[PDB]
Nucleic acid binder design. Structure first.
Ligand SMILES: [Mg+2]
Ligand SMILES: [Mg+2]
Ligand SMILES: [Mg+2]
Ligand SMILES: [Mg+2]
Ligand SMILES: [Mg+2]
Ligand SMILES: [Mg+2]
Ligand SMILES: [Mg+2]
Ligand SMILES: [Mg+2]
Ligand SMILES: [Mg+2]
Ligand SMILES: [Mg+2]
Ligand SMILES: [Mg+2]
Ligand SMILES: [Mg+2]
Ligand SMILES: [Mg+2]
Ligand SMILES: [Mg+2]
Ligand SMILES: [Mg+2]
Ligand SMILES: [Mg+2]
Ligand SMILES: [Mg+2]
Ligand SMILES: [Mg+2]
Ligand SMILES: [Mg+2]
Ligand SMILES: [Mg+2]
Ligand SMILES: [Mg+2]
Ligand SMILES: [Mg+2]
Ligand SMILES: [Mg+2]
Ligand SMILES: [Mg+2]
Ligand SMILES: [Mg+2]
Ligand SMILES: [Mg+2]
Ligand SMILES: [Mg+2]
Ligand SMILES: [Mg+2]
Ligand SMILES: [Mg+2]
Ligand SMILES: [Mg+2]
Ligand SMILES: [Mg+2]
Ligand SMILES: [Mg+2]
Ligand SMILES: [Mg+2]
Ligand SMILES: [Mg+2]
Ligand SMILES: [Mg+2]
Ligand SMILES: [Mg+2]
Ligand SMILES: [Mg+2]
Ligand SMILES: [Mg+2]
Ligand SMILES: [Mg+2]
Ligand SMILES: [Mg+2]
Ligand SMILES: [Mg+2]
Ligand SMILES: [Mg+2]
Ligand SMILES: [Mg+2]
Ligand SMILES: [Mg+2]
Ligand SMILES: [Mg+2]
Ligand SMILES: [Mg+2]
Ligand SMILES: [Mg+2]
Ligand SMILES: [Mg+2]
Ligand SMILES: [Mg+2]
Ligand SMILES: [Mg+2]
Ligand SMILES: [Mg+2]
Ligand SMILES: [Mg+2]
Ligand SMILES: [Mg+2]
Ligand SMILES: [Mg+2]
Ligand SMILES: [Mg+2]
Ligand SMILES: [Mg+2]
Ligand SMILES: [Mg+2]
Ligand SMILES: [Mg+2]
Ligand SMILES: [Mg+2]
Ligand SMILES: [Mg+2]
Ligand SMILES: [Mg+2]
Ligand SMILES: [Mg+2]
Ligand SMILES: [Mg+2]
Ligand SMILES: [Mg+2]
Ligand SMILES: [Mg+2]
Ligand SMILES: [Mg+2]
Ligand SMILES: [Mg+2]
Ligand SMILES: [Mg+2]
Ligand SMILES: [Mg+2]
Ligand SMILES: [Mg+2]
Ligand SMILES: [Mg+2]
Ligand SMILES: [Mg+2]
Ligand SMILES: [Mg+2]
Ligand SMILES: [Mg+2]
Ligand SMILES: [Mg+2]
Ligand SMILES: [Mg+2]
Ligand SMILES: [Mg+2]
Ligand SMILES: [Mg+2]
Ligand SMILES: [Mg+2]
Ligand SMILES: [Mg+2]
Ligand SMILES: [Mg+2]
Ligand SMILES: [Mg+2]
Ligand SMILES: [Mg+2]
Lengths: 114, 209, 123, 54, 119
RNA sequence: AGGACCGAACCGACUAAUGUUGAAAAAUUAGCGGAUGACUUGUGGCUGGGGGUGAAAGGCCAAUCAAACCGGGAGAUAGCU
RNA sequence: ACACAGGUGGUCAGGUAGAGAAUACCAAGGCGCUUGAGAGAACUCGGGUGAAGGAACUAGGCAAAAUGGUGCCGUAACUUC
RNA sequence: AAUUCCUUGUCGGGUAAGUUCCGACCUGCACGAAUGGCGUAAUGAUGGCCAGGCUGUCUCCACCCGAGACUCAGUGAAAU
RNA sequence: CGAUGUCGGCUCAUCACAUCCUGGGGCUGAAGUAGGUCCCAAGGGUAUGGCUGUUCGCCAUUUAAAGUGGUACGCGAGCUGGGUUUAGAACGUCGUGAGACAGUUCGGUCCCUAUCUGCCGUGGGCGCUGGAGAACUGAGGGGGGCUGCUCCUAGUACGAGAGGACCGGAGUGGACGCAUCACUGGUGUUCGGGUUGUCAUGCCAAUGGCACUGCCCGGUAGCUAAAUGCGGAAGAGAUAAGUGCUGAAAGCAUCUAAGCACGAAACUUGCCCCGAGAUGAGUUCUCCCUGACCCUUUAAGGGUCCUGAAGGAACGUUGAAGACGACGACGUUGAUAGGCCGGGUGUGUAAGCGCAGCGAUGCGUUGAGCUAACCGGUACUAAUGAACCGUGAGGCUUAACCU
C-alpha cells in the first residue's frame, strides 16, 4: 500500500552501509543512564540479516568473557548510531547457525579478498 | 461524541527521538458527511446518520439513490449512525472534516472480528486438554463432562461448547493516538485494532478515558 | 523465563556451580522469571570448599537467560547459558564477592546496586 | 444410541419437509443454432455464443 | 484454517499432485484441447501457461528447465518450435475453459480446456 | 566344543495404539523372545467319556469342558416364575 | 457362510552396492487391490517439525525421543576361572 | 522381610521434602533346617528404587501433509 | 435383583453461607503496629511438589487465601484400571483334608454411530394485512467486577524507648480474558541448496523419480504465543449492620412512633455484546405500480388479454466469509479470481563457455539464477442477449381538518 510506503520512507535512514553474512561488525549503541547519554561499542560476527525495509534487522554474536552473547538489532532505529564493517568473510550460506554450538579454533570464517 | 468511520489498511511502527518502537496502525478516514439528522419530534432520539466511501452507479439501487439525491452527496458505501448529546448545532449538507480527533488524547475503536470458523472446545473457551498418553483412548481433546446426575439431569443454559469463533462486533478502548494526517487522510493509533485489514471500523472519542 | 526444575549455572565465586530452581516467588500461580526476580534454589554441586555446602536452601536472582531480555526498541539480547547469582535469605544481597560473565542493564535499581559494580560488562 | 419409541409418519414427513429439490429455473438459448442449453454451458451440438468448437 | 492460502489439494498426496499434472500438461500441449473435470482444469491453468511464458524466450538453459518441468523430448521441441511464437504478443492467458455438463458413472462435472488457437 | 552369543526363514506371542453390529466370533502396523536344539514341520498309524492325553493351567479332545457330540427312557421331575 | 487386510508343505534364485535369502532401487515378469467427484470445520486414526525448561506428568519414563556398523587403543568391583 | 497386626515400628544414608528402596537393631502378634535354612558368579519379554543421556509425557499445546468424518452422484444395512 | 458400574485421580461446573481472602461498622484486658471475638456481607479469587492405590495426613515451599458442604460421598452411552473384585501362584496362620482369611504381595479384555428432552452454533417457510431495499429505538437477556508491592504524606501522629500508621495520591508486576502479527520466534511435505544408494532420459555433463519431504540445512504470506496493545474502573440512586439530628408516648434520657442525614466489592445503574417471531410483532427517511372487461361467489368472490416495474432468487468469477447453507465483492459501463510485465522477498554465484591443474576443485561473466499465497499494475482467458419470480391504489368500523 502507498499509504504504508508513504510513511515507511519518512522514518528510514540513508546512512546504512552494506554487508554480507559472516563478518565482524562494530556497532555504536547510545545508552542512557542518569543524565548522561553515552556510546557503547559492540563487536562480533553477524550470522542473520533480515531485509524488510523499515523492519530490517541483523544478529551479532560474540564470546564475551565466556558467556556467549547474541543480540539482534533494529537497523533503522535511533538506538544505533553507526555501523562499520571490520573484516569481511566468505561463507556459502546466509543463516550461519552452526556458529552457535561451536567455539574456539574450529568456529572460524575464512577471509574474503577483492 | 460524533464518531467517524475508517478502514484499516496496514500495521507499521512510529519511532521516537529516543528509540521507543511504538506499535501503531493506519485507519484511513476520508471526510465523512452528514446524511440524516434526527431528533425526538422527528424520530424519537437525537442522533446523526452518515456515510463515506464510494459505490458504483449501476449497483446503487433505486431506494438508496433517492436517499442520496435527497441530500446531495456522492455515492458512498455504508450507512452508520452515531448517538449524540445536547449542546450542538448541526445541518445535513455540511461534511465532517477529518480533524475532529485533533485534540483528543484517548479514543475508542469498535469493529468486526476475524472469522475463525467452527472452532473447538480447546480453542475458543480455553479448555485444558487431557492426557495424550498413559492409557487414554479417544478422548484427547473432547470437553469431558458437562452436567451432573439426575438432579438436574440436564445440561444447563449458559454452558460453553464448540461454535463459531468471534466474527462479531468487538470493542477496544482508551487507545493512544499519536498523529493525524491532513495530507493523505490517516489516523495513527497505537496497538492492534480489531478485524482484518480491508474492513471498516467505527472510531470515536473514548467513553471514559 | 525460568520455571521450576530449571538447572542453572552459578555466575559468582560462592562455590556452587550447578543449582536447581524449586520455586518462583512473588505472586500466585506464577510460571516465569527473567531478570530482576528472586527465585528460590537448592545447591547441587559445590567446589571442594566454599561458603555454601551441598543441600542448602537459599534465594537467588536470575541474571542471564537464554530466552533473552527485550529492550524498548524491540531488540532482544540473548545469552548461551541459563545462569543466576546467589543471594541471602535475610539480606537479599549476595554471598560471594566476584561476579563472572556479563550482566544486563535492565537489572540496575537500588535493591540491586551491588551486582552492577563487580560485573565486568553491564550489557 | 438406541431409541425408546417408534415415531410416526408425521415426524417422518416433518423431517422430510426440507428435501425440496427445485429444477432448473430457466434455460437459455443460442444465437446461431438455437437450442435450449444450460446457462453457462456448451450445447450437446458444441455451440457456445456463436462459436462451433467441436 | 485456510485463510489467504493458495493451491488445491484435490484428494491426492503430493507425490501424486505433480505426477498427474505432468501427464495432463503432457497431453494438453500435445492435443491443444482436452476433456477433464473442472477443478482439475481450473488449476491446470497456471501449470501449463507459465510453462509457455517461459518458452516464449528461447535459450539453451530453458531447454533444460522445461525438460525438468515435463521430462518429454517431444514436448520440449514442440513447445519451443510451434507453441512458442504463436502467442508471442499476449500478456498471458493461453487457455480457455468451456463447461460440458456432467459425466456418466460418477456425476463428475467436466470441462473442455483449450488453447485459443485452433483456426 | 556348545541344551553358546548378535541375527533373516521358521516357531512363539511381552507391552502400547487401532478396534470392539470391525477386513478377523482373537487379527493388522511399529517394537519383542528363541532361532543345530528338551527345537520347528509335511505325511500316515495308535488312545478313548468316569475313560484317553497332560514339561500340570482342571488345560485340551472338531469355533463346545469340574465330565464332550448324537439317538433313546423322556412329554425325566419342579412346592418355583 | 463374504470375489475375506486370516492360514496352508515342496521346487528355481538376475543386476549395483551389501558379511548375507536383511535392507534401498531395479530388469525378466506381473498389478493399480470393482464406488466416485469435490470443499480444505470441530474431532478421531496414522505421521513429520518445534523456541525456554527437561519426568515438575503419572500408579508407574506407559508411549515417544535417543543409542546403534567396521578397525584400533582401552575395560571396575565380584567369581563357579 | 513375598511372612510384622498395633505401624508411616526405631536409627542412619539417599531427597529441599521420601507410608515404597538399601544398611542395622529384635519387643519375631504368627521364619527355621529336604511342603527345606542361609548364601552366591552368570541369566530372566521378571518384582521394587535412584542416576547420566533423551525428548510434547507434562507447565502450554501451535502448525503442517495424508486416510475418515461435512456436500453432490450410484448401491444401501443393523441394535431397538 | 427379567441388573440402577462402586473409591480416588484427569476434564468441566453450579448453587448453598455456618465467609479463608478482600468490603463497612460496634466491643476489647484496643496507645500505634498487629490481633482477639461475635454482627452485616457469597460479587469476585482460592499452591505447584515428595511419599504411598488413596480423599485426608505428614513434610518441603509460596500467597491476600490455600474455606466448609450437597449435587447417585457430581460426572466410566466422556477418559483412566493402581485400589477392592473372577480364573493362576506363594508366605504367614487355621483345618487331617477339599480350601478359606477388610492379612499380604506379582500378573490380570472397561462395549455403543444419538431416536427424544436438554445445550452451543448455523439456517429455510410463513406472519408481522398493500410488496420490496436499508439504517435503528430497546422491555428483557448475557458475559465483566480480583488482588500484591514499592514510592509521596512521613519516619508525621501515637509511643518512654523499641517500633510505626489512618486518610488520600503516583508507579510496576502475576493469575484470568479480549483482540491482532509491525517487532522476537514457531510451523512453512506448494519456495532455493547440499547430500548419499540405485535405475532409466543412447552417452559425458545436466535434470527427474523412488527409500517416513530418503537425511538435512534455510524460508515468503497465512495460521499461531512464549511475542505487545486494552480491560477489572470513576460516578448516581435507594439499601443490610452501625453512628446520627429533632422529639412525645412516659412533662425527664429515647436513631422512631411523624419526619430529616450518612452508610460496602452484595442491589439497580454506569462499561460492553447477540438484541421487534417484544404476537404488547414497533419506530423510521426513502423508490415503484393511476389497464379493459364480462361471469354469480352480488363483491374481501372465479377467469381471457397488453400488463411482469421497484426488487430478489438462480447461473458464472470468487474472497483475510465458510461443514452444507448463510454473509460480502465483481458481472464488459468492470480488476472478482487465475494469467503477464516491472518490483519485492526467500535461497545463495545456476547451465553454458575460456583459463588453472595429475584431479577432486576454484576463479571470470556473477549477488547471477530460480521465486508459493505477498504490495502497487495490464482486458490476453474466464465472468452471455435474455429468460424466470414479485403486480395494477390496499379490508372494515369509528374519530378529526378540508373542499
Ligand atoms: Mg475467516
Ligand atoms: Mg494435565
Ligand atoms: Mg483401544
Ligand atoms: Mg490416541
Ligand atoms: Mg424401560
Ligand atoms: Mg487468494
Ligand atoms: Mg503357544
Ligand atoms: Mg499375554
Ligand atoms: Mg507383528
Ligand atoms: Mg539369536
Ligand atoms: Mg542360540
Ligand atoms: Mg462321561
Ligand atoms: Mg475347545
Ligand atoms: Mg457326570
Ligand atoms: Mg421313567
Ligand atoms: Mg418337560
Ligand atoms: Mg413331569
Ligand atoms: Mg476384489
Ligand atoms: Mg477396494
Ligand atoms: Mg474419496
Ligand atoms: Mg484437516
Ligand atoms: Mg519429531
Ligand atoms: Mg521442545
Ligand atoms: Mg530447529
Ligand atoms: Mg512425580
Ligand atoms: Mg519405552
Ligand atoms: Mg522410535
Ligand atoms: Mg521386601
Ligand atoms: Mg509374619
Ligand atoms: Mg502391614
Ligand atoms: Mg527414612
Ligand atoms: Mg533392611
Ligand atoms: Mg515355610
Ligand atoms: Mg519337613
Ligand atoms: Mg526363558
Ligand atoms: Mg524421583
Ligand atoms: Mg479406508
Ligand atoms: Mg461418509
Ligand atoms: Mg448419499
Ligand atoms: Mg429392566
Ligand atoms: Mg442391583
Ligand atoms: Mg452470617
Ligand atoms: Mg474483630
Ligand atoms: Mg455470588
Ligand atoms: Mg463464589
Ligand atoms: Mg454489582
Ligand atoms: Mg502431581
Ligand atoms: Mg514415589
Ligand atoms: Mg494433598
Ligand atoms: Mg453424598
Ligand atoms: Mg452425602
Ligand atoms: Mg464430595
Ligand atoms: Mg461418585
Ligand atoms: Mg456417566
Ligand atoms: Mg470416576
Ligand atoms: Mg488390578
Ligand atoms: Mg441425527
Ligand atoms: Mg440432531
Ligand atoms: Mg432467517
Ligand atoms: Mg445485570
Ligand atoms: Mg508473526
Ligand atoms: Mg507483513
Ligand atoms: Mg521445514
Ligand atoms: Mg539418483
Ligand atoms: Mg552423470
Ligand atoms: Mg521409479
Ligand atoms: Mg515418496
Ligand atoms: Mg527462521
Ligand atoms: Mg511466518
Ligand atoms: Mg442516599
Ligand atoms: Mg426527650
Ligand atoms: Mg435521644
Ligand atoms: Mg474492586
Ligand atoms: Mg460500583
Ligand atoms: Mg483495472
Ligand atoms: Mg489477472
Ligand atoms: Mg515479477
Ligand atoms: Mg538472497
Ligand atoms: Mg540447482
Ligand atoms: Mg556455473
Ligand atoms: Mg567475484
Ligand atoms: Mg540469485
Ligand atoms: Mg493485485
Amino acid at each position: 500500500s502507498n499509504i504504508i510506503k508513504q510513511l515507511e520512507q519518512e522514518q528510514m535512514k540513508q546512512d546504512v552501509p552494506s554487508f554480507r553474512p559472516g563478518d565482524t561488525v562494530e556497532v555504536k549503541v547510545w545508552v542512557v543512564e542518569g543524565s548522561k547519554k553515552r556510546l557503547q561499542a559492540f563487536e562480533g560476527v553477524v550470522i542473520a540479516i533480515r531485509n524488510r525495509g523499515l523492519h530490517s534487522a541483523f544478529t551479532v554474536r560474540k564470546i564475551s568473557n565466556g558467556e556467549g552473547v547474541e543480540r539482534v538489532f533494529q537497523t533503522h532505529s535511533p538506538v544505533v548510531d553507526s555501523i562499520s564493517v571490520k573484516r569481511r568473510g566468505a561463507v556459502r550460506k546466509a543463516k550461519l547457525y552452526y556458529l552457535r554450538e561451536r567455539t574456539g579454533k574450529a568456529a572460524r570464517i575464512k577471509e574474503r579478498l577483492n | 461524541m460524533i464518531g467517524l468511520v475508517g478502514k484499516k489498511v496496514g500495521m507499521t511502527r512510529i519511532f521516537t527521538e529516543d528509540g521507543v518502537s511504538i506499535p501503531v496502525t493506519v485507519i484511513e478516514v476520508e471526510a465523512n458527511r452528514v446524511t440524516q439528522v434526527k431528533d425526538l419530534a422527528n424520530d424519537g432520539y437525537r442522533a446523526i446518520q452518515v456515510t463515506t466511501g464510494a459505490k458504483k452507479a449501476n449497483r446503487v439501487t433505486k431506494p438508496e439513490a433517492g436517499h442520496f439525491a435527497k441530500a446531495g452527496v456522492e455515492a458512498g458505501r455504508g450507512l452508520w449512525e452515531f448517538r449524540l448529546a445536547e449542546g450542538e448545532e448541526f445541518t445535513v449538507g455540511q461534511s465532517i472534516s477529518v480533524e475532529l480527533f485533533a485534540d483528543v488524547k484517548k479514543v475508542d475503536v469498535t469493529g468486526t472480528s476475524k472469522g475463525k470458523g467452527f472452532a473447538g472446545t480447546v480453542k475458543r473457551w480455553n479448555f485444558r486438554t487431557q492426557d495424550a498418553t498413559h492409557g487414554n483412548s479417544l478422548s484427547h481433546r473432547v470437553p469431558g463432562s458437562i452436567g451432573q446426575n439426575q438432579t438436574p439431569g440436564k445440561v444447563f443454559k449458559g454452558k460453553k461448547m464448540a461454535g463459531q469463533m468471534g466474527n462479531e462486533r468487538v470493542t477496544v478502548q482508551s487507545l493512544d493516538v499519536v498523529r493525524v494526517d491532513a495530507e493523505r487522510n490517516l489516523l495513527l493509533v497505537k496497538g492492534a485494532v480489531p478485524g482484518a485489514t480491508g474492513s471498516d471500523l467505527i472510531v470515536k472519542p473514548a467513553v471514559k478515558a | 523465563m525460568i520455571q521450576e526444575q530449571t538447572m542453572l549455572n552459578v555466575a559468582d565465586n560462592s562455590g556452587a556451580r550447578r543449582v536447581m530452581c524449586i520455586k518462583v516467588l512473588g505472586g500466585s500461580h506464577r510460571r516465569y522469571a527473567g531478570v530482576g526476580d528472586i527465585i528460590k534454589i537448592t545447591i547441587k554441586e559445590a567446589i571442594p570448599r566454599g561458603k555454601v555446602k551441598k543441600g542448602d536452601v537459599l534465594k537467588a536472582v536470575v541474571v542471564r537467560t537464554k530466552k533473552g531480555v527485550r529492550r524498548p526498541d524491540g531488540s532482544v539480547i540473548r545469552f548461551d547459558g541459563n545462569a543466576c547469582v546467589l543471594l541471602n535469605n535475610n539480606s537479599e544481597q549476595p554471598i560471594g564477592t566476584r561476579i563472572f560473565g556479563p550482566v544486563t542493564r535492565e537489572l540496575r535499581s537500588e535493591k540491586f546496586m551491588k551486582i552492577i559494580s563487580l560485573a565486568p560488562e553491564v550489557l | 444410541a438406541v431409541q425408546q419409541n417408534k415415531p410416526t409418519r408425521s415426524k417422518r414427513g416433518m423431517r422430510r419437509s426440507h428435501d425440496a429439490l427445485t429444477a432448473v429455473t430457466s434455460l437459455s438459448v443460442d444465437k446461431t443454432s438455437g437450442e435450449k442449453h444450460l446457462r453457462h454451458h456448451i450445447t450437446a451440438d458444441g455451440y457456445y455464443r456463436g462459436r462451433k468448437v467441436i | 484454517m485456510r485463510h489467504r492460502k493458495s493451491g488445491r489439494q484435490l484428494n491426492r498426496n503430493s507425490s501424486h499432485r505433480q505426477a498427474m499434472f505432468r501427464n495432463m500438461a503432457g497431453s494438453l500441449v500435445r492435443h491443444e484441447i482436452i476433456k477433464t473435470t473442472l477443478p482439475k482444469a481450473k488449476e491446470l491453468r497456471r501449470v501449463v501457461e507459465p510453462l509457455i511464458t517461459l518458452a516464449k524466450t528461447d535459450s539453451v538453459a530453458n531447454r533444460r528447465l522445461a525438460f525438468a518441468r515435463t521430462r518429454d523430448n517431444e514436448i520440449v521441441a514442440k513447445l519451443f518450435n510451434e507453441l512458442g511464437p504463436r502467442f508471442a504478443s499476449r500478456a498471458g492467458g493461453y487457455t480457455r475453459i468451456l463447461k460440458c455438463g456432467f459425466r456418466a458413472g460418477d456425476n463428475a462435472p467436466m470441462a473442455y480446456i483449450e488453447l485459443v488457437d485452433r483456426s
